Design a binder for this molecule. Structure first.
Ligand SMILES: N[C@@H](CCC(=O)O)C(=O)O
Length: 250
């Protein structure tokens, strides 16, 4: 009635994972304990974690937070979901929160909260063509669905995570990195020497948002929605944007 199991996934700066304080053995500052799918030990912080803390306090629930090890955000393969979406769909978690993109395919099988971060797809370049994404998420899904020819060309340039993609772009092994807009634009704002930009001064293609995934028909959607909408109006989400997503490059 009031304890929720919450799945999440590291994606800085929305979810950042760090070891517990070696001195105290606890999660200090603004961090909260989070265990692996596989209190204290690993600690989680970030924009989405601050949202979660506020939801817990406002609605009045306790929670158990864990990091997904079975895939990442969510992909359906041969009829089976993995990642955060899978955790919710198979009811291993009451909800999933992180940089989780709302799309049609996912919306069919889980309920999403109202979106609380605007996102989409952007293209990052250094300030035949080699362009890649990190596969298995909403970006690859969109490209495969709407631009199958281009998708087929991108497969050999798949990257394992954002950090490697950025390294490859900087080194010229990629000419462009195509990825979630909210993350890419943050990375552009934080880039050493400001050598990386997103096309169109941050143009967002395929506009959508991050949402909290809940069981289809979850009794939690309404309270979560009201709280998020309340946060938006109290300028609380704007504060969190300034706190977590600001950078110096512009
Ligand atoms: N936010 C994306 C992951 C990154 C991407 O594919 O752009 C998702 O939920 O699948």
């Amino acid at each position: 009635t009031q304890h929720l199991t919450v799945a999440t996934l590291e994606e800085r700066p929305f979810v950042i994972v760090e070891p517990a304080d070696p001195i105290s053995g606890t999660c200090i500052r603004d961090s909260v304990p989070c265990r692996s799918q596989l209190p204290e030990k690993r600690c989680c912080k970030g924009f989405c974690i601050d949202i979660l803390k506020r939801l817990a306090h406002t609605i009045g629930f306790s929670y158990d937070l864990y990091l997904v090890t079975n895939g990442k955000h969510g992909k359906k393969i041969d009829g089976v979901w993995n990642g955060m979406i899978g955790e919710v769909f198979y009811q291993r978690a009451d909800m999933a929160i992180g940089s989780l993109t709302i799309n049609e395919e996912r919306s069919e099988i889980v309920d999403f909260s109202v979106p609380f971060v605007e996102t989409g797809i952007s293209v990052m370049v250094a300030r035949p063509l080699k362009f890649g994404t990190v596969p298995n998420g909403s970006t690859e899904k969109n490209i495969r669905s709407n631009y199958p020819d281009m998708h087929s060309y991108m497969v050999r340039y798949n990257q394992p995570r954002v950090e490697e993609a950025l390294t490859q772009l900087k080194a010229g092994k990629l000419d462009a990195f195509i990825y979630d807009a909210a993350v890419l634009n943050y990375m552009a704002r934080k880039d050493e020497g400001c050598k990386l930009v997103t096309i169109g001064s941050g143009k967002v293609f395929a506009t959508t948002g991050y949402g909290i995934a809940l069981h289809k028909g979850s009794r939690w959607k309404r309270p979560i929605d009201l709280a998020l909408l309340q946060f938006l109006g109290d300028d609380e989400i704007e504060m969190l944007e300034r706190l977590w997503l600001s950078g110096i490059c512009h």
